[PDB]
Amino acid sequence: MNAPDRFELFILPDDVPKLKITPDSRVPNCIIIKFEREDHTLANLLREELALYPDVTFVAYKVEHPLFANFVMRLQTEEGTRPKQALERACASIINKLKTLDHKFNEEWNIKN
Amino acid sequence: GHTGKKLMAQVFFGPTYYQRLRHMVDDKIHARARGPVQVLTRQPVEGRSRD
Amino acid sequence: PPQVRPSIAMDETTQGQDDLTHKLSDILKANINVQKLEMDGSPQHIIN
RNA sequence: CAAUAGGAGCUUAC
């Protein structure tokens, strides 16, 4: 009677953006990203990918409430680098790693026959 | 579950017989803004079922 | 007033008066019976 | 635009 729908986890409304960027003014060259309709699956992947770059000084995420399907991420970078470009770089790197993983799994599965 | 990292502590784990008791929140949740009053005292009536 | 002793409805067509109303009716019956003794024979064991 | 009362019984959390 107060239970929301189980499909609001993934169905993006038309008035709700997928992604929203605001800057953290306290420290230089830092941004706060809120990902709507996502959870730990994307958050942990991105966080541990970004944490290994030399030019990334701060990266973290949290899910403020388990009953709401979003997370917020704080990311800081050095002076020359922009956190957004590093975010695209991390996304592309994980995509390439997954493509290589898929190719090797398919070849291995064929060889196993 | 969130990170796949091992937990530093080990967890007591196994099956246990649990029971579903008759007390459900949906049988208890009640709110009232305005509603029926008593004839004699003209004060809010008594009862979740009576609002 | 009847506000202090309102009637009520039991099954959509029936009503019983409050206790105070029946008590007042009993008092009225008693009063009229008193007014039926000082008007005729009353051998002192009915007036009391 | 209007959904009785009184009782008894069994329960909930302290």
Coordinates of all heavy atoms in Angstrom, one line a residue, chain B residues 23 36 38 49-51, chain D residues 3-6 11-12:
Chain B
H23 N 0.8 -10.1 12.9 CA 0.9 -8.7 13.1 C 1.6 -8.2 11.8 O 2.8 -8.2 11.7 CB 1.6 -8.3 14.4 CG 1.1 -9.1 15.6 ND1 0.0 -8.7 16.3 CD2 1.6 -10.2 16.1 CE1 -0.2 -9.5 17.3 NE2 0.7 -10.5 17.2
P36 N -15.5 11.0 11.5 CA -16.7 11.0 12.3 C -16.4 11.2 13.8 O -15.3 10.9 14.3 CB -17.2 9.5 12.1 CG -16.0 8.8 11.6 CD -15.1 9.7 10.9
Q38 N -18.1 11.3 18.0 CA -19.2 10.6 18.8 C -20.4 11.5 18.9 O -20.3 12.8 18.9 CB -18.6 10.3 20.1 CG -17.7 9.1 20.2 CD -17.9 8.3 21.4 OE1 -18.0 8.9 22.5 NE2 -17.8 7.0 21.3
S49 N -10.6 0.7 12.6 CA -11.6 0.4 11.6 C -12.7 1.4 11.4 O -13.3 1.5 10.4 CB -12.3 -0.9 12.0 OG -13.0 -0.8 13.3
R50 N -12.9 2.2 12.5 CA -13.9 3.3 12.4 C -13.4 4.6 12.0 O -14.1 5.6 12.0 CB -14.6 3.4 13.8 CG -15.6 2.2 14.1 CD -16.5 2.0 12.9 NE -17.8 1.6 13.3 CZ -18.8 1.1 12.5 NH1 -18.5 0.8 11.3 NH2 -20.0 0.9 13.0
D51 N -12.1 4.7 11.7 CA -11.4 5.9 11.3 C -11.3 6.9 12.5 O -11.6 8.1 12.4 CB -12.0 6.6 10.1 CG -11.1 7.7 9.5 OD1 -9.9 7.6 9.7 OD2 -11.7 8.6 8.8
Chain D
rA3 P -21.7 9.5 8.7 OP1 -20.6 9.7 9.6 OP2 -21.5 8.8 7.4 O5' -22.8 8.6 9.4 C5' -22.5 7.6 10.4 C4' -22.5 6.2 9.8 O4' -21.8 6.3 8.5 C3' -21.7 5.2 10.6 O3' -22.5 4.6 11.7 C2' -21.4 4.2 9.5 O2' -22.5 3.3 9.2 C1' -21.1 5.1 8.4 N9 -19.7 5.4 8.3 C8 -19.1 6.6 8.6 N7 -17.8 6.6 8.5 C5 -17.6 5.3 7.9 C6 -16.4 4.7 7.6 N6 -15.2 5.3 7.6 N1 -16.4 3.5 7.1 C2 -17.6 2.9 7.0 N3 -18.8 3.3 7.4 C4 -18.7 4.6 7.8
rU4 P -21.9 3.4 12.5 OP1 -20.4 3.5 12.6 OP2 -22.5 2.1 11.9 O5' -22.5 3.6 14.0 C5' -22.5 4.8 14.5 C4' -23.4 4.8 15.8 O4' -24.6 4.0 15.5 C3' -22.8 4.2 17.0 O3' -21.9 5.0 17.7 C2' -24.0 3.8 17.8 O2' -24.6 4.9 18.5 C1' -25.0 3.4 16.7 N1 -25.0 1.9 16.4 C2 -25.7 1.0 17.3 O2 -26.3 1.5 18.3 N3 -25.7 -0.3 17.0 C4 -25.1 -0.9 15.9 O4 -25.1 -2.1 15.8 C5 -24.4 0.0 15.1 C6 -24.4 1.4 15.3
rA5 P -20.7 4.3 18.5 OP1 -19.8 5.4 18.9 OP2 -20.2 3.1 17.8 O5' -21.4 3.9 19.9 C5' -22.2 4.8 20.7 C4' -23.1 4.1 21.6 O4' -24.0 3.2 20.9 C3' -22.5 3.1 22.6 O3' -21.9 3.8 23.7 C2' -23.6 2.2 22.9 O2' -24.5 2.8 23.9 C1' -24.3 2.1 21.6 N9 -23.9 0.9 20.9 C8 -23.2 0.9 19.7 N7 -23.0 -0.3 19.3 C5 -23.7 -1.1 20.2 C6 -23.9 -2.5 20.2 N6 -23.4 -3.4 19.3 N1 -24.7 -3.0 21.2 C2 -25.2 -2.1 22.1 N3 -25.1 -0.8 22.2 C4 -24.3 -0.3 21.1
rG6 P -20.4 3.3 24.2 OP1 -19.7 4.5 24.8 OP2 -19.8 2.5 23.2 O5' -20.8 2.3 25.4 C5' -22.0 2.5 26.2 C4' -22.6 1.2 26.6 O4' -23.2 0.5 25.4 C3' -21.7 0.2 27.2 O3' -21.5 0.4 28.6 C2' -22.4 -1.2 26.9 O2' -23.4 -1.4 27.9 C1' -23.1 -0.9 25.6 N9 -22.4 -1.4 24.5 C8 -21.6 -0.8 23.6 N7 -21.1 -1.6 22.7 C5 -21.7 -2.8 23.0 C6 -21.5 -4.1 22.3 O6 -20.8 -4.4 21.3 N1 -22.2 -5.1 22.9 C2 -23.0 -4.9 24.1 N2 -23.6 -6.0 24.5 N3 -23.2 -3.8 24.7 C4 -22.5 -2.8 24.1
rU11 P -4.8 -14.7 25.2 OP1 -4.1 -16.0 25.6 OP2 -4.9 -13.6 26.2 O5' -4.1 -14.2 23.9 C5' -3.3 -13.0 24.0 C4' -3.3 -12.2 22.7 O4' -4.6 -11.5 22.6 C3' -2.3 -11.1 22.5 O3' -1.1 -11.6 22.1 C2' -3.0 -10.2 21.6 O2' -2.9 -10.7 20.2 C1' -4.4 -10.3 22.0 N1 -4.8 -9.2 23.1 C2 -4.7 -7.9 22.8 O2 -4.3 -7.5 21.7 N3 -5.0 -7.0 23.8 C4 -5.5 -7.4 25.1 O4 -5.8 -6.5 25.9 C5 -5.6 -8.8 25.3 C6 -5.3 -9.6 24.3
rU12 P 0.3 -11.1 22.8 OP1 1.4 -12.0 22.4 OP2 0.0 -10.9 24.2 O5' 0.5 -9.7 22.1 C5' 0.5 -9.5 20.7 C4' 0.9 -8.1 20.3 O4' -0.3 -7.3 20.4 C3' 1.9 -7.5 21.1 O3' 3.3 -7.8 20.7 C2' 1.6 -6.0 20.9 O2' 2.1 -5.5 19.7 C1' 0.1 -6.0 20.9 N1 -0.5 -5.7 22.2 C2 -0.6 -4.4 22.6 O2 -0.2 -3.5 21.9 N3 -1.2 -4.2 23.9 C4 -1.6 -5.2 24.7 O4 -2.1 -4.9 25.8 C5 -1.5 -6.5 24.2 C6 -0.9 -6.7 23.0

